[PDB]
């Protein structure tokens, strides 16, 4: 099988700044025509692959000038000239000169925005959650960057270790942001038996770590 | 216009099988050649097999890893193409694309079919509202959202007012809990002076165990 190597893993932007990626294929691309065996996919957030480049250098419909490919034989480079917020996602290169068909690793395009503190909310359990027998809380930490946040919870001061679960959104292809849940599991009889449920978030965007709390039974 | 349904997804056992299809529209299958490409949750790009067209003799050619377990075919008097797949292993769960190389759609993948092999059994959510509150806004902000909980397999979607409200979403990605089971939660963040007169609605399907349910989501 032919091997490709895609170069970084990673890379973070600041928009109208540009962006290379390189691809080394383990095997000989070359064609008699000029071209090569070589194409570009783009995978934004929550999408399918898309085209961008093939036969190494040709631009897939409706993908502007700023995006171009180049290279010969096994050494690739993909260029973004002026790079956008719409351009954050993970790039694949990917030969189809014979089968099986080979996928370089993939690199993730960053796109570097200013810092950007979050907004922080705390949803206490429902009263239909309760009812149920069963009781979350979720911290939601809303439009941040950098994406390195931390979020501590207490109940009671007592600090909680291991009875939360974060999920982060991908990077927000139009304000470049992530969003935060840390969402704290207890038993009904465990949130009965307390009063103060806190959600300590620390990120570069705070001066110092903000705490959102409420009192079971508003108290 | 020019469409690609896929279908034939969704939960399968260990050394069970599946059967997924490749629907065209607009467009006719065999003059192109079809390719099947997976990718497991946050994972890289796996090419499967392919079907060369009718002018190519209807050739296949399969994935090594895909050891003797596939069969790629297609139903020319349906326009569909179909992989067949057998045996199924806990690391053949991914999304599953089909893949045009023609003419038409070229180099264009269909929005793919969850595959999920797995012992485990179908679990309905519960819908939880994440009501806005004094502590759930910020300002001239509020947020509020929809609780998924205890469903199984993926995926979950969420749609808020339906469809009418995209501006502020987040739908978060499931987390698999301690019981097996996912969660996740839906979130939109709104200007608090329309809490008392803007409805907010969030519209759940969990299609793996028919569950459709549209939660009104109220201050207090």
């Known amino acids: 099988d032919i091997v490709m190597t895609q170069s970084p893993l990673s890379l973070s932007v600041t928009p109208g700044e540009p962006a290379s990626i390189s691809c080394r294929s383990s095997q000989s691309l070359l064609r008699r025509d000029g071209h090569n065996d070589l194409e570009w996919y783009l995978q934004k957030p929550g999408q399918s692959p898309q085209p961008l480049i093939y036969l190494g250098s040709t631009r897939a419909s409706g993908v502007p000038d700023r995006f171009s490919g180049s290279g010969s034989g096994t050494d690739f480079t993909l260029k973004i000239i002026r790079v956008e917020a719409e351009d954050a996602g993970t790039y694949y290169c990917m030969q189809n000169k014979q089968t099986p068909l080979t996928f370089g690793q993939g690199t993730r395009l960053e796109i570097k925005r200013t810092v950007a503190a979050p907004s922080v909310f705390i949803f206490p359990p429902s009263d239909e959650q309760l009812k149920s027998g069963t009781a979350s809380v979720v911290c939601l930490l809303n439009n941040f960057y950098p994406r390195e946040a931390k979020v501590q919870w207490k109940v009671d001061n007592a600090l909680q270790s291991g009875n939360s679960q974060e999920s982060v959104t991908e990077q927000d292809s139009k304000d470049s942001t992530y969003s935060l849940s840390s969402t704290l599991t207890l038993s009904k009889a465990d949130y009965e038996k307390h009063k103060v449920y806190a959600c300590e978030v620390t990120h570069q965007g705070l001066s110092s770590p903000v705490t959102k709390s409420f009192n079971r039974g508003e108290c | 216009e020019v469409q690609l349904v896929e279908s034939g997804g969704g939960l399968v056992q260990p050394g069970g099988s599946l059967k997924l299809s490749c629907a065209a529209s607009?467009?006719?299958?065999?003059?192109?050649?079809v390719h099947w490409v997976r990718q497991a949750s946050g994972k890289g790009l796996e090419w499967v097999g392919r079907?060369?067209?009718?002018?190519?003799?209807?050739?296949?050619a399969y994935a090594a890893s895909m050891r003797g377990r596939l069969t790629i075919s297609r139903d020319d008097s349906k326009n569909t193409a179909f992989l067949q797949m057998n045996s199924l292993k806990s690391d053949d769960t991914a999304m599953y694309y089909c893949?045009?190389?023609?003419?038409?759609?070229?180099?264009?993948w269909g929005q793919g079919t969850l595959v999920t092999v797995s012992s485990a059994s179908t679990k309905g959510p519960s819908v939880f509202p994440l009501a806005p509150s004094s502590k759930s806004t910020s300002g001239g902000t509020a947020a509020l959202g929809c609780l998924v909980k205890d469903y199984f397999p993926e995926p979950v979607t969420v749609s808020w007012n339906s469809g009418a409200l995209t501006s502020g979403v987040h739908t978060f990605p499931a987390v698999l809990q301690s019981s097996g089971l996912y969660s996740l939660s839906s979130v939109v963040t709104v200007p608090s002076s329309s809490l008392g007169t803007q409805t907010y609605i969030c519209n759940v399907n969990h299609k793996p165990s028919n569950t459709k349910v549209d939660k009104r989501v109220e201050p207090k």
């Open positions: 607009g467009f006719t299958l065999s003059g192109s050649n």
């Open positions: 079907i060369k067209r009718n002018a190519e003799s209807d050739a296949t």
């Open positions: 893949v045009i190389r023609g003419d038409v759609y070229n180099r264009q």
